Design a protein around this ligand. Structure first.
Ligand SMILES: Nc1ccc(CCCNc2ncnc3c2ncn3[C@@H]2O[C@H](CO)[C@@H](O)[C@H]2O)cc1
Ligand SMILES: [K+]
Ligand SMILES: [K+]
Length: 546
DNA sequence: TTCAAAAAGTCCCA
DNA sequence: ATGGGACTTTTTGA
């Protein structure tokens, strides 16, 4: 449970918080890491501090106690008054204490401000000038329930339904930062856009001045770790300035060690830089450049409806154990199941633009099985193979669901109708019209048009514009970037997409119908579809004035 | 009763 | 062995 931050990032963070420190004015800075681990950040802080003190040793000796300020006394001073670390791992603290002791190589048995504790529970007796480090990331599934009760009761300003632990670490760091202090940390990027991060974003916006956001997007910073990172730097300084420097990466395939320093990478063509006014932040943080801001605002102003206005959205089936209820359509065991119980089953990869692949799987809609005696063959020879796993589901332990029932079988009538489907995680917009009453898991989302908006919007028109290049860019501006070439397509953002209706409605609809007709051929002339899409994109750009 | 969010993702191969 | 690519379950709070 210990993660090594790359040295280039560690150096950038420490330098970010200490480059302009006035050691003459304040020779007693407090630099804290509340998840210090083996001291990836703190040892570097020691190096920076030692150079800072030794470069001004004679100035300090003249302004202050001349006997206290010598080179020989630097190592002691740093440990007594400057470096502070906290971590839950005892072995890590022991190792870091030995490393800090070996920075000099007893005289008086120097005390080192290292605490082996839960930083979210520690009674912190004073605030700190500088806070750096890499907090732990633990999500809603992997966090202990008993501990989650404490977080919900005590960190309710940032920790709620599906929040993450590092939300609480952000709140703690902000709370124990001195007036005029500086904090710089590396966390997941997901709180910048996620629905769970709304309270955290409000807290950060309204309690600190955000200096800088480095967004690495899908680039893999931590080797062999599936997480997407960002660096946040904030302060509590009295300033009328309220502008943020945003560095957003341009090529996610870059390796982090191209130059000797991260700042060389940030100044290069690998990153784009722009400024965001913190006072103009809403509940969402729309961090885009002026071209994209103009693009987004044009679209928002022009469109008079949203998908939420005109549609009904729902998440797919959650069986609770897929292997028990999902079978290949050529499985011999499917001869045991009456066709009234069987539904077509698709995965996210089966969703293309405008149409769905033919399904290869069948769902046993076991909610329609009455009792265990009439269909004993289905239960004993198909579903019962996983009975233990099925009995451990939450709604079975509580007794709400029978052991063979789907955990969340939703409502059949919602699926057995003409509707639009899209994958929950994709590199591009893929909205299809489903004609075959397809069921799917939560990896696919569905919506259908309300009855009162059918005369205004058709499924063909909607899949026309939603699959356009304009709308790919428009959705990705505010979407949640998960990993390299993966965006979240969830209703909490998909339903916010704004749509329009003007003189180009009929031609866009006709082009969409032609695309759908071609895609459903035996001899698919795939080429002409691209030409038709280009023409449709021209129509949409004409419609939205871009 | 029953919705929808959640990557320190998961798994595989060259 | 690692780094990169294809693909995506069900646990969980509200
Ligand atoms: N059972 C159990 C339940 C909940 C928790 C959460 C406790 C949160 N409070 C914590 N307080 C201090 N340090 C913590 C910490 N959680 C993780 N670390 C350290 O962060 C580094 C980055 O990974 C590593 O060196 C971890 O050892 C911990 C255990
Ligand atoms: K003096
Ligand atoms: K990543």
């Amino acid at each position: 449970g210990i993660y090594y931050t790359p040295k280039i990032i560690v150096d950038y963070i420490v330098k970010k918080t200490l480059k302009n420190h006035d050691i003459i004015k304040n020779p007693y800075p407090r630099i804290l890491d509340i998840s210090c681990g083996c001291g990836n950040f703190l040892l570097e802080v020691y190096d920076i501090l030692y150079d800072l003190f030794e470069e001004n040793i004679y100035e300090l000796k003249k302004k202050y106690d001349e006997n206290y300020w010598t080179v020989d006394n630097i190592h002691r001073h740093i440990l007594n008054y400057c470096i502070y670390g906290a971590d839950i791992d005892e072995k890590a603290i022991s190792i870091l204490k030995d490393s800090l002791t070996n920075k000099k190589v007893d005289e008086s048995d120097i005390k080192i401000n290292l605490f082996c504790c839960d930083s979210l529970k520690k009674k912190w007796r004073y605030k700190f000038d500088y806070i750096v480090g890499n907090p732990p990331y633990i999500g809603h599934k992997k966090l202990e329930k008993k501990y989650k009760k404490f977080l919900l009761e005590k960190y309710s300003e940032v920790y709620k339904d599906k929040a993450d632990l590092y939300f609480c670490f952000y709140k703690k760091i902000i709370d124990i930062l001195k007036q005029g202090g500086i904090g710089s940390v590396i966390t997941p990027r997901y709180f910048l856009e996620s629905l769970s991060g709304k309270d955290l974003r409000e807290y950060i916006k309204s309690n600190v001045n955000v200096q800088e956001i480095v967004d690495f997007l899908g680039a893999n910073i931590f080797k062999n770790i599936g997480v997407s990172s960002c660096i946040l730097t904030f302060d509590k300084k009295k300033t009328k300035e309220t502008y943020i420097d945003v560095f957003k990466i341009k090529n996610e395939d870059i390796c982090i060690n191209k130059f000797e320093t991260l700042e060389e990478l940030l100044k290069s063509s690998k990153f784009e830089h722009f400024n965001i006014n913190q006072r103009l932040l809403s509940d969402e943080w729309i961090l885009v450049n002026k071209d994209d801001e103009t693009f987004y605002n044009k679209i928002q102003e022009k469109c008079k409806y949203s998908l939420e206005d005109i549609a009904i959205s729902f998440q797919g089936i959650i069986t609770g154990c897929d292997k028990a209820f999902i079978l290949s359509k050529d499985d011999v065991k499917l001869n045991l199941v009456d066709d009234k119980f069987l539904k077509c089953w698709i995965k996210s990869k089966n969703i293309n633009k405008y149409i769905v692949d033919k399904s290869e799987y069948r769902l046993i809609y076991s909610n329609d099985i009455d009792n265990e005696n009439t269909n004993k063959r289905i239960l004993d020879e198909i579903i019962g193979l996983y009975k233990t796993k099925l009995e451990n589901r939450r709604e079975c332990k509580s007794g709400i669901r029978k052991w063979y029932e789907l955990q969340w079988g939703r409502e059949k009538l919602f699926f057995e109708r003409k509707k639009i489907m899209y994958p929950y995680k994709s590199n591009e917009n893929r909205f299809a019209i489903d004609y075959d009453n397809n069921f799917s898991s939560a990896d696919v989302y569905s919506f259908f048009i309300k009855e009162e908006y059918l005369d205004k919007f058709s499924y063909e028109y909607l899949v026309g514009i939603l699959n356009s290049s304009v709308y790919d860019k428009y959705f990705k501006i505010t979407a949640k970037k998960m990993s390299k070439n993966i965006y979240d397509y969830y209703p909490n953002k998909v339903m916010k997409i704004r749509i329009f209706r003007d003189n180009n409605y009929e031609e866009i609809e006709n082009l969409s119908k032609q695309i759908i007709s071609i895609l459903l051929n035996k001899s698919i002339d795939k080429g002409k579809v691209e030409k038709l899409q280009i023409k449709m994109d021209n129509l949409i750009m004409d419609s939205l004035g871009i």
